[PDB]
């Protein structure tokens, strides 16, 4: 899914099997699963990393299957969900680090293009999240404000 | 200048090669043969034809009288041998390293290995690291003399073929060149 | 310029590079006698 700026037909990904009900081999209930989610967010892990750890260590496939809820739903219930969304945050951190690189390296135009594409993605997601309310309407990407944000 | 005022100034190799006569140069005013250089194909120790391709360059140092004694300047492998080595569907991994021996001789060592097949750049640089590590430790633990002897021999190349067979199988590693830079 | 591969062919033509160069010389003369002389 290099699509969107590279147009390679990559198919790497997950293959969730159709599951109307949770697996019987699973030990944990919805409640303790939620507790683990909250524990790991306090340990400082993003939701993606939380699902990864619960898949690899605790053998939990699809917190959604188990609890009926999503990880970010659990986080916002326990008052721990991130202020701005994670994917946007990640892009912004990338862009800031790259801004720094490019100030010390002005002739790296290929990395400059990578920055341009990164900020394009940012703008797209900002548009969508303004439209859906996950950001204020007046929110807008800016490099310096984003630097303060990350920091 | 006529050629009859010339005296033949027999030329001897260094000590650690066995101070054999490696030839004789004509000259007058023996200051004229100081910087001169002789190349020989390890016919110093020609009890082996395994090494007819190893050209050793010595340089006259301190002629005494009708006896010109030399120093080791470097060695190279013969272009014939190298062009036999480097083929297609075959990989060439060279490494050029500056090393100070235990006794302060500075050398540039251009070693090389030949992997059987077309391999990855990461493997190539792993082997380059192997070469670097072997050469560096040999240099810091050995002196100029036995180092050079190893290298004009093949103990080092053999260690390198071994200790790099673990990255990829190897076909006839070598050391390919040494040149001296300094001799404190 | 806008160019034409058709013009680049040579079946009944002069070479396009040189046609082009002629055109540009003419244009230069015209520009020259237009603005200042």
């Amino acid at each position: 899914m290099a699509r969107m700026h590279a147009r390679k037909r990559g198919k790497s990904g997950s293959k969730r099997p159709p599951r109307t009900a949770p697996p019987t081999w699973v030990e944990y209930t919805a409640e303790e699963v939620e507790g683990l989610v909250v524990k790991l967010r306090k340990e400082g892990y993003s939701a993606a990393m939380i699902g990864t750890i619960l898949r690899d260590q605790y053998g939990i496939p699809s917190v959604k299957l188990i609890t009926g809820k999503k990880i970010t739903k659990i986080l916002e219930e326990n008052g721990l969900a991130p202020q701005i969304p994670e994917d946007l945050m990640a892009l912004i951190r990338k862009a800031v680090n790259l801004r720094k690189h490019l100030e010390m390296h002005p002739k790296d135009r290929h990395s400059m293009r990578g920055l341009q594409l990164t900020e394009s993605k940012i703008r797209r997601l900002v548009k969508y999240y303004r439209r859906t309310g996950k950001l204020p309407a007046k929110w807008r990407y800016d490099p310096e404000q984003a630097k303060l944000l990350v920091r | 200048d006529k050629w009859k005022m010339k005296e033949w100034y027999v030329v001897y190799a260094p000590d650690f090669f066995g101070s054999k006569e490696i030839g004789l140069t004509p000259a007058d005013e023996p200051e004229k043969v100081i910087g001169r250089v002789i190349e020989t194909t390890l016919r110093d120790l020609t009890g082996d034809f395994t090494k007819g391709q190893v050209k050793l360059y010595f340089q006259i140092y301190d002629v005494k009288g009708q006896n010109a004694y030399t120093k080791f300047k470097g060695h190279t492998l013969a272009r014939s041998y190298i062009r036999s080595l480097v083929r297609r569907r075959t990989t060439r991994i060279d490494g050029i390293f500056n090393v100070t021996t235990k006794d302060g001789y500075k050398l540039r060592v251009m070693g090389m290995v030949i992997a059987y097949r077309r391999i990855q750049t990461s493997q190539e640089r792993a082997i380059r690291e192997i070469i670097r590590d072997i050469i560096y430790k040999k240099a810091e633990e050995l002196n100029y003399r036995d180092f050079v002897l190893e290298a004009v021999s093949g103990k080092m190349a053999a260690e390198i073929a071994k200790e790099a067979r673990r990255i990829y199988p190897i076909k006839r590693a070598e050391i390919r060149k040494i040149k001296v830079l300094a001799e404190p | 310029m806008k160019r034409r591969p058709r013009k680049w062919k040579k079946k009944g033509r002069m070479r396009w590079k040189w046609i082009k160069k002629r055109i540009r010389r003419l244009k230069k003369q015209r520009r020259k006698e237009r603005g200042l002389i």
């Binding site: 997950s14 293959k15 969730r16 099997p17 159709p18 697996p23 081999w25 699973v26 030990e27 990864t52 750890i53 898949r55 690899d56 260590q57 605790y58 053998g59 496939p61 | - | -």
Partner: protein, 63 residues
């Protein structure tokens, strides 16, 4: 009907026990993180580009 209809995982969840504590623990065969025993901190599977390399499963199951 085969191999693209209902694309199904090749990976498996599998039950292992550590050699040190012996606690049975479910894990994933293709982990992105080094999996540690919940009791001892021992690595049960070390991550790779694909199927993780398994330590400490001498009594094993797979679901």
């Amino acid at each position: 009907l085969p191999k693209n209809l209902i694309p199904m995982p090749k990976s498996r969840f599998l039950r292992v026990k550590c050699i040190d504590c012996g606690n049975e623990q479910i894990v994933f065969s293709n982990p992105s993180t080094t999996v540690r025993c919940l009791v001892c901190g021992a690595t049960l599977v070390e991550p790779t580009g694909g199927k993780g390399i398994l330590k400490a499963k001498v009594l094993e199951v797979l679901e």
